[PDB]
Write an enzyme that holds these catalytic residues in place. Structure first.
Site, PDB file in Angstrom:
ATOM      1  CD  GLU A   1      -3.135  -0.672  -0.031  1.00 19.14           C
ATOM      2  OE1 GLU A   1      -3.057   0.421  -0.629  1.00 19.14           O
ATOM      3  OE2 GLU A   1      -4.006  -1.527  -0.298  1.00 19.14           O
TER       4      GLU A   1
ATOM      5  CG  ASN B   1      -8.666   6.869  -4.366  1.00 17.75           C
ATOM      6  OD1 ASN B   1      -7.681   6.178  -4.611  1.00 17.75           O
ATOM      7  ND2 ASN B   1      -9.127   7.048  -3.134  1.00 17.75           N
TER       8      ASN B   1
ATOM      9  CG  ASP C   1     -13.845   8.622  -5.326  1.00 13.05           C
ATOM     10  OD1 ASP C   1     -12.660   8.946  -5.094  1.00 13.05           O
ATOM     11  OD2 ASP C   1     -14.530   7.963  -4.524  1.00 13.05           O
TER      12      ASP C   1
ATOM     13  CB  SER D   1     -11.831   9.735  -1.970  1.00 17.12           C
ATOM     14  OG  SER D   1     -11.673   8.649  -2.870  1.00 17.12           O
TER      15      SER D   1
ATOM     16  CG  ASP E   1      -6.583   5.605  -0.927  1.00 21.22           C
ATOM     17  OD1 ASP E   1      -7.746   5.991  -0.685  1.00 21.22           O
ATOM     18  OD2 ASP E   1      -6.312   4.733  -1.771  1.00 21.22           O
TER      19      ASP E   1
ATOM     20  CG  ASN F   1     -11.059   6.057   0.006  1.00 29.26           C
ATOM     21  OD1 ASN F   1     -11.095   7.285  -0.095  1.00 29.26           O
ATOM     22  ND2 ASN F   1     -11.507   5.247  -0.949  1.00 29.26           N
TER      23      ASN F   1
ATOM     24  CG  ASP G   1     -16.060  -2.866   6.747  1.00 33.46           C
ATOM     25  OD1 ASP G   1     -15.572  -3.989   6.481  1.00 33.46           O
ATOM     26  OD2 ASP G   1     -16.107  -1.937   5.911  1.00 33.46           O
TER      27      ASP G   1
END
Ligand SMILES: [Cl-]
Ligand code: NA
Length: 129
Positions: free
Chosen positions: A35, A46, A48, A50, A52, A59, A101
């Site tokens: 990562e 990203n 969209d 957003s 990281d 994110n 989650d």
């Protein structure tokens, strides 16, 4: 801060990630390597809009506030900048919420593609833990 492999493994183990939700330490170290290349200051944007953040590339779409991802959530209740600290505490605590989650470590694309189903114990091999 750019962690060494064993240094990060030890920091993660101290922060309670070893076997957290059934994921052995090597899984977490492997995820971090691909990562962020073990760099707490890693950032990536990203499509969209957003971003990281940090060693586990958490994110801003869901997990932290960066003030520039409209209509996003802040499920870890932290500013995204906190995830870039040399102290990995904030990243680890947020990672614990993410991995609980429902989808496990599959939340981390690099883990799914590069660690999952591999010999992840190789990532902590030789380390003093
Ligand atoms: Cl799971
Ligand atoms: Na937010």
């Amino acid at each position: 801060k750019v962690f060494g492999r064993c240094e990060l493994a030890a920091a993660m183990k101290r922060h309670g990630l070893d076997n957290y939700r059934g994921y052995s330490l090597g899984n977490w170290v492997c995820a971090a390597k691909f990562e962020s290349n073990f760099n707490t200051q890693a950032t990536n944007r990203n499509t969209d809009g957003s971003t990281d953040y940090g060693i586990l590339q958490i994110n801003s779409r869901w997990w932290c506030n960066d003030g520039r991802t409209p209509g996003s959530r802040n499920l870890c209740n932290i500013p995204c900048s906190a995830l870039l600290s040399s102290d990995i505490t904030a990243s680890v605590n947020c990672a614990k919420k993410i991995v609980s989650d429902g989808n496990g470590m599959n939340a981390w694309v690099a883990w799914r593609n590069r660690c999952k189903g591999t010999d992840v114990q190789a990532w902590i091999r030789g380390c003093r833990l």
